[PDB]
């Protein structure tokens, strides 16, 4: 059946080439380019004592949670740099953290193969583990809440999972990746999510159906970071091949590549500005590069981290970008 | 500040104090990354020292060790191998009685050891190499020669010489001045691998300190 699989792959390639009328760069040749997006470190979040692997902004655009290998999940008041909570993890090997959209929960996970759900708002004044989501046979590399009861996780077991937090059971398992799944991005409508894996492919999943709608393959190496465009009709991937790629869901192919000859390091994290014209990517070369998502131009640089920028996030109101890094600091930028 | 802002700042300061205390307590831990391949003596040395990552905590001669057993992670190591970039040493377990077995076991262990040695995150990370099952190796080396694994051996078939050749093959992968491979041969019935790891870690710390002073 390998012949039929190759035939269907060639049919998909032909259908993608039939839609490749004019590249994104040909249509965005006339928009005024952004001049120089010069963000400045407004806050520096100090208090992690190891490499920060994940951060996730709150929906209030003021609180954010960061995950560090020091075994601490810290919730930051990014306006005042106050530490709202410092959650001691059972496993210090956390590499993902998600802040629930309601703000009542935070999630984290990593080499323990568990998504730990933490109740931030309990009658007792401490944050406790509300649920530990076991069932992944590899490390959890990303987790994102759909709501207070549903969270999507990606794992090094090459699968993604949808969980019911109350039952602590996998409602849906999203299989189809052959490499380790490294990142997740939920659509703004949260009806569907994209996952990027070590197989150098991004797969689009229906949350309710539990099936892979589309598979996106432009990257030459492991995809570490994935993020939808703000309207949910596109997403950007960040991989180890020093390139960022924008894939359209409807066009079902890559629309733009965000690469530079002076960048050879891998890409750890990607996020979009509120309008989605800026793609902010975190790199192994210790800084974050800001990309004109429409013109692929390198709009700006966020230098200021002494180690690899492992994570970054834009606030839901678009005011600020927080970049975490292996140097144990989070910086808020404007 | 507001009264509530002032109390929030006080809470943040208490959190910062606890974070500093936790980091101080954590910096006193000697973190060991246990590696190896399947049926090597990883579990044997974990039992001697005493879910995706297993963490063995032990104290030996006033030194607290955190041994991270990550063999359950049946995924791509390079995606999570940087998590252990700052370990004091890697403990690599190799079954000596694996030269005669294919599933070659000893070629797989050598390839894994080479990848760990020449990993960009372990450039200066010393390795406490354990050559496990030396007794089974001695049992099966008198019958079958050390040619099923290494055709280019062309040496004596005695246990000591074959084991020394295997150790030399493993240390040939070091190719680094700032990293040392500490090789010990174990038989699963010796209660001194705790001492071996303690001495290797002491040597690693001493050599790191000497490198700091420019004396190494």
């Amino acid at each position: 059946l390998r012949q039929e699989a190759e035939q269907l792959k060639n049919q998909i390639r032909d259908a993608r080439k039939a839609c490749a009328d004019a590249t994104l760069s040909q249509i965005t040749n006339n928009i005024d380019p952004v001049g120089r997006i010069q963000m400045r470190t407004r806050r520096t979040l100090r208090g992690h004592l190891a490499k920060i692997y994940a951060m996730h902004w709150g929906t209030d655009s003021r609180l954010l949670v960061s995950a560090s290998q020091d075994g601490k999940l810290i919730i930051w008041d990014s306006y005042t740099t106050n530490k709202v909570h410092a959650i001691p993890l059972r496993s210090s090997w956390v590499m993902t953290c998600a802040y629930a959209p309601s703000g009542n929960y935070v999630a984290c996970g990593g080499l323990d193969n568990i998504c730990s759900i933490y109740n931030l708002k309990t009658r007792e004044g401490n944050v406790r583990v509300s649920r530990e989501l076991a069932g992944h046979t590899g490390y959890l590399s990303c987790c994102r809440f759909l709501d207070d009861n549903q969270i999507v996780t990606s794992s090094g077991d090459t699968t993604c999972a949808l969980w019911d937090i109350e039952t602590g059971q996998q409602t849906t398992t999203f299989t189809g990746h052959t490499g380790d799944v490294m990142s997740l991005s939920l659509a703004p409508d949260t009806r569907l999510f994209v996952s990027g894996a070590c197989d150098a492919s991004a797969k689009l999943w229906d949350v309710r159906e539990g099936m892979c709608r589309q598979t996106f393959t432009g990257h030459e190496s492991d995809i570490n970071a994935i993020c939808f465009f703000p309207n949910g009709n596109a997403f950007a991937t960040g991989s180890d091949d020093a390139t960022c790629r924008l894939f359209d869901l409807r066009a079902d192919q890559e629309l733009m590549t965000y690469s530079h000859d002076n960048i050879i390091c891998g890409i750890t994290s990607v996020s979009f500005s509120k309008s989605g014209r800026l793609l902010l990517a975190g790199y192994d070369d210790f800084n974050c590069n800001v990309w004109d998502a429409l013109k692929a131009d390198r709009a700006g640089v966020l230098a200021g981290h002494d180690n690899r920028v492992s994570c970054l996030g834009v606030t839901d109101d678009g005011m600020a970008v927080a970049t975490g890094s292996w140097d144990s600091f989070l910086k808020i930028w404007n | 500040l507001s009264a509530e802002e002032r109390a929030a700042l006080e809470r943040s300061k208490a959190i910062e104090k606890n974070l500093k205390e936790d980091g101080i307590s954590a910096a006193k831990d000697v973190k060991l990354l246990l590696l190896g391949a399947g049926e090597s003596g990883k579990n044997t040395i974990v039992k001697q020292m005493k879910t995706g990552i297993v963490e063995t905590h032990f104290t030996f001669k006033n030194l607290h060790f955190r041994l991270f057993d990550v063999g359950a992670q049946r995924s791509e190591r390079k995606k999570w191998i940087h998590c252990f970039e700052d370990v004091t040493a890697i403990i690599f377990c190799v079954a000596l009685s694996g030269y005669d077995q294919v599933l070659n076991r000893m070629h797989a262990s050598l390839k894994l050891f080479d990848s760990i040695c020449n990993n960009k995150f372990f450039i200066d990370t010393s390795i406490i190499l354990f050559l496990n099952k030396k007794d089974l190796f001695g049992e099966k080396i008198k019958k079958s020669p050390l040619t099923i694994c290494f055709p280019e051996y062309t040496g004596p078939n005695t246990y000591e010489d074959a084991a020394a050749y295997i150790q030399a093959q493993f240390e040939s992968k070091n190719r680094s001045p700032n990293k040392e491979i500490y090789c010990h041969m174990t038989c699963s019935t010796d209660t001194n691998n705790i001492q071996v790891v303690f001495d290797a870690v002491t040597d690693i710390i001493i050599a790191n300190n000497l490198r700091g002073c420019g004396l190494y």
Epitope: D60, R62, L63, D77, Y79, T80, N82, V84, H85, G103, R123, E124, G125, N126 | S2, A3, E4, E5, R6, A7, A8, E10, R11, S12, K13, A14
Partner: single-chain antibody, 232 residues
Framework: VQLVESGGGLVQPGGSRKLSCSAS????????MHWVRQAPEKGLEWVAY????????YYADTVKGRFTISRDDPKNTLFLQMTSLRSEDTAMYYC??????????????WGQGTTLTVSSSDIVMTQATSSVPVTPGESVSISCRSS???????????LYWFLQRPGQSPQLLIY???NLASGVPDRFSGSGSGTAFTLTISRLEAEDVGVYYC?????????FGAGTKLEL
């Protein structure tokens, strides 16, 4: 979560005794602790505050120097050492659970209280109305006035609404102006701006009968308005 006070009783004027608070069911060490007293017929009046970790301690001017608030985190106990017990110190003394971080709900849990009986610049909260008669099912708005703007430059308006039900300890309804407390039905509403505040009850039940108290938390000598009672 429960806070159990002990002590109280009857003392001679000029005497001394220690109030205790047996906290249980919550992370007592992480909460700032208040003593708030209520004279037998008058409204609530904040007495003393000990922060989480005992780093910060505040007192009302009428008890400062003579009263000493202390906590013992390992035994989850809060103390009020009272000295030179004047006749004005007779009241029901309430221990109040309060935690402070962004988004937190201070003054959210109150102890049952113990009655102490003694034998014989501050911001002002004004509740002009009192003992307003209400009819179940219809809306009522309880007004509050502050001598100073409770709105801070940070954007928060540190106005608290408490419901002291008959015979029951106070119960937070709204913590910062227009912020519904946990477990409070979403028919209580808070609004206002600057110095003028109203608490609207949409469809008042028979359980909303009680005295409703203001509280500012802007400047620390926390002051309650004289309660606005609701009666059938």
């Amino acid at each position: 979560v429960q806070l159990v006070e002990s002590g109280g009783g009857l003392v001679q004027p000029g005497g001394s005794r220690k109030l205790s608070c047996s906290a249980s069911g919550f992370a007592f060490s992480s909460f700032g602790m208040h003593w708030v007293r209520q004279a037998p017929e008058k409204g609530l009046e904040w007495v003393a505050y000990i922060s989480s970790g005992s780093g910060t301690i505040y007192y009302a001017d009428t008890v400062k120097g003579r009263f000493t608030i202390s906590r013992d985190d390992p035994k989850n106990t809060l103390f009020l050492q009272m000295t030179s017990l004047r006749s004005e110190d007779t009241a029901m003394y309430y221990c109040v659970r309060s935690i402070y971080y962004y988004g937190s709900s201070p003054f959210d849990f109150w102890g049952q209280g113990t009655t102490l009986t003694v034998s014989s610049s501050d911001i002002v909260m004004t509740q002009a109305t009192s003992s307003v008669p209400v009819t179940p099912g219809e809306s009522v708005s309880i007004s509050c006035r502050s001598s100073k703007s409770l709105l801070h430059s940070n954007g928060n308006t540190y106005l608290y609404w408490f419901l002291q039900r008959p015979g029951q300890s106070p119960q937070l309804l709204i913590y910062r102006m227009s912020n519904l407390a946990s477990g409070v039905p979403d028919r209580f509403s808070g609004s206002g701006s600057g110095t003028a505040f109203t608490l609207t009850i949409s469809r008042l039940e028979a359980e909303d009968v009680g005295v409703y108290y203001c509280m500012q938390h802007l400047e620390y000598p926390l002051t309650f308005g004289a309660g606005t009672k609701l009666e059938l």
